[PDB]
């Protein structure tokens, strides 16, 4: 078959893959990006389409404009199980036309010298001499089966992780996902009968009965269009998520016109710390494939762009040293962990605590204001549950006269603090990965027991 040689092969053109291509463009490298979907459908995976504005600023990513920006977000209203207490969190964000923006990022990267092949699937990984040296592609637009060699393969295949899963199981880069470390999520976009009240605000409904292990959401895409859906924890034996959706839709979205359905569908969402290493010999993994999703609220498009940035940084370093080993690509880990990874690890622990709380716990916690918005902002943005804040909440929880998991909040804050410092001390070399990883596991397995 035909053989082509590139510097970098990016597999997957999602938020992760497109950002990696964008950040790498116009810097002396020959890049090829492939995606199984046709160009017009790239980036249409079922999503809430809600991304923070802060993510676009930090990475120097182009703002969504025109048709790419369906609705400006100014904050989030989150509700209690009994709908009695409503917290409001202010902050600017965007309700996106995800495929439209995703395709502009691709188009711009293409204008910057990056070659993009749509309708192309990476079938078989080229693994020779202990290294990832490319992949076998199938371009069904030209019906070709090409062999593409590369110094670095960027794995950005989403939750399916279809490429790296076909690699030898001895590679740390083939770490799989535990069922309970993921949520299944489903959403629909409908037009509403009446105009949406406070359409510049997102709505999040916490309820362990209507969405166990997750939550419901009401994300307005305009004055009369809303993205409504839910997420539940996998590997728990819960019935189909569409059963939960069909049963409790009217509670969280009574205003929607069910005869004006636009899109529908669902997918898997990783809710854990990232891969213990996101880089190995001749390969870097980003996006959902590298578990870059926020463990608490499930947002992963912002952190996918971040992983793409760090992937671009590490690859440029690898070429300047001519070293494409795990050691030569190790900056991928150091960069991402400092940017979002260390936060994920801390929120991984906090997630496990939240998922086991009862509706009575959440109702009491929100009504009695165990934390204020000042520390809530500090939480899901820095991953820090300050010990002074936990103490302030525990004094309120002390007023509870019934048994509850809330009484372990201080111990949770200490475990979060512990694993946070552990990730900030991420191994400087691949030869320390095994030792560090087992220490992380010990922290987690210990914590799982402390919640009982
Ligand atoms: C229902 C629901 C709701 C939400 C969310 C998820 C889900 C399922 N998320 C998470 C967010 O959707 C997700 O984390 C990001 O899209 C991750 O971007 P990726 O590019 O890694 O994935 P993505 O799946 O988009 O990328 C995979 C791409 O690679 C291609 N591909 C795969 N295998 C291939 C192969 N072998 N060869 C070629 N191409 C291949 C696929 O065709 C696809 O284009 C979210 N996030 C957020 O920030 N806020 C939100 O509101 C939500 N809400
Ligand atoms: C539904 C699933 C699976 C995930 C949803 C993921 C979420 C909640 C995304 C929300 C992103 C968004 C539009 C946030 C806007 C509101 C907000 C609190 C933004 C916080 O970001 P910053 O802009 O940094 O906040 P500040 O600058 O105000 O501190």
Which atom from ligand 2 is nearest to the alpha carbon of 75? Answer: 16
Query: CB of 290 closer than 6 A to ligand 1?
Result: no
Total count of residues recorded for the chain: 452
Q: Which ligand neighbours the alpha carbon of 378 most closely?
A: 2
Strand order in the sheet with 31-35: 115-118, 31-35, 8-11, 152-155, 283-285, 279-280
Structure tokens, 242: 């569409």
Rounded CA gap, 13 and 121, in Å?
A: 11
Query: CB of 52 closer than 6 A to ligand 1?
Result: no
Compute CA distances 404 → 356, 398, 451, whole Å. Answer: 10, 11, 11
- Ligand 1 center from residue 147 Cα (angstroms): 25
Residue 16 annotated as part of some ligand binding site: yes
Structure tokens, 231: 């997420």
For a ligand 2 pocket test, name from 15, 47, 49, 53 the mutation site with the most ligand atoms within 8 angstroms of its C-beta.
53
Residues paired with 149 in a beta bridge: 5, 134
Rounded CA gap, 316 and 295, in Å?
A: 29
- Ligand 1 center from residue 344 Cα (angstroms): 18
Boundaries of domain holding 56: 1-452
CA 381 to chain CA centroid, Å, is 14
Residue 12 sits in a domain of what CATH number?
3.50.50.60
Residue 44 annotated as part of some ligand binding site: no
Residue 30 annotated as part of some ligand binding site: no
Find the residues whose C-beta lies inside 6 A of ligand 2: 48, 50-54, 73, 75-76, 89-93, 185, 217, 231, 269, 297-299, 377
Contact 72, 198 (CB under 8 A): no
Rounded CA gap, 210 and 231, in Å?
A: 10
- Ligand 1 center from residue 385 Cα (angstroms): 29
Using DSSP's 3-state secondary structure scheme, residue 354 falls into helix
> 255: which residues sit within 8 A by CB, 6+ positions away?
192, 193, 194, 196, 226
Contact 333, 306 (CB under 8 A): no
Residue 172: closest CA among 419, 418, 432, 352: 432
Total domain count for the chain? 1
Contact 68, 104 (CB under 8 A): yes
């Amino acid at each position: 078959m035909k053989e082509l040689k590139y510097d970098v092969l990016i597999i997957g053109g999602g938020f992760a893959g497109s950002s990696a291509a964008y950040q790498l463009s116009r810097r002396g490298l020959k890049i090829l990006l492939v995606d199984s979907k046709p160009w017009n459908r790239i980036g249409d995976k079922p999503c809430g389409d809600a991304v923070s504005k802060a993510h676009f600023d930090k990475l120097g990513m182009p703002y969504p404009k025109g048709e790419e920006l369906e609705n400006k977000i100014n904050g989030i209203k989150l509700y209690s199980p009994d709908m009695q207490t409503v917290w409001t969190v202010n902050g600017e964000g965007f309700e996106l036309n995800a495929p439209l923006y995703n395709q502009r990022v691709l188009k711009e990267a293409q204008d910057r010298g990056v070659e993009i092949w749509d309708l192309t699937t990476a079938m078989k990984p080229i693994f020779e001499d202990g290294y990832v040296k490319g992949a076998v592609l199938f371009n069904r637009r030209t019906n070709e089966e090409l062999t593409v060699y590369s110094k670095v393969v960027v794995e950005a295949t989403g939750y399916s992780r279809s490429f790296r899963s076909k690699l030898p199981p001895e590679l740390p880069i083939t770490e799989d996902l535990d069922d309970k470390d993921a949520d299944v999520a489903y959403r629909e976009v409908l037009l509403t009968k009446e105009d949406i009240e406070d359409h510049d605000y997102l709505r999040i409904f916490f309820d362990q009965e209507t969405s166990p292990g997750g939550y419901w959401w009401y994300f307005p895409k305009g004055k009369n269009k809303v993205n409504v859906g839910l997420g539940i924890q996998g590997g728990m034996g819960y019935p189909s998520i569409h059963e939960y959706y069909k049963k409790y839709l009217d509670k969280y979205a009574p205003d929607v016109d069910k005869s004006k359905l636009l899109v529908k569908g669902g997918a898997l969402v990783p809710t854990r710390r990232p891969l213990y290493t996101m880089a190995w010999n001749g390969i870097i993994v980003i996006g959902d494939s590298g578990f870059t999703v926020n463990p608490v609220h499930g947002g992963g498009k912002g952190s996918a762009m971040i992983s793409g940035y760090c992937a671009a940084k590490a690859i440029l370093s690898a070429f300047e040293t001519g070293d494409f080993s795990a050691s030569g690509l190790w900056d991928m880990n150091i960069c991402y962990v400092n940017e979002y990874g260390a936060k994920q690890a801390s929120l991984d622990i906090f997630r496990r605590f939240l998922q086991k709380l009862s509706n009575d716990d959440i109702n009491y916690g929100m009504k009695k204001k165990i934390i204020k918005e000042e520390d809530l902002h500090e939480a899901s943005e820095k991953g820090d549950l300050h010990l002074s804040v936990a103490d302030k909440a525990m004094r309120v929880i002390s007023g509870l006269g019934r048994p509850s998991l809330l009484f372990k909040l201080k111990a949770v804050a200490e475990s979060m603090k512990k694993i946070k410092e552990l990730y900030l001390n991420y191994p400087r070399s691949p030869s320390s990965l095994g030792s560090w990883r087992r220490e992380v596991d010990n922290v987690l397995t210990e914590f799982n027991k402390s919640l009982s």
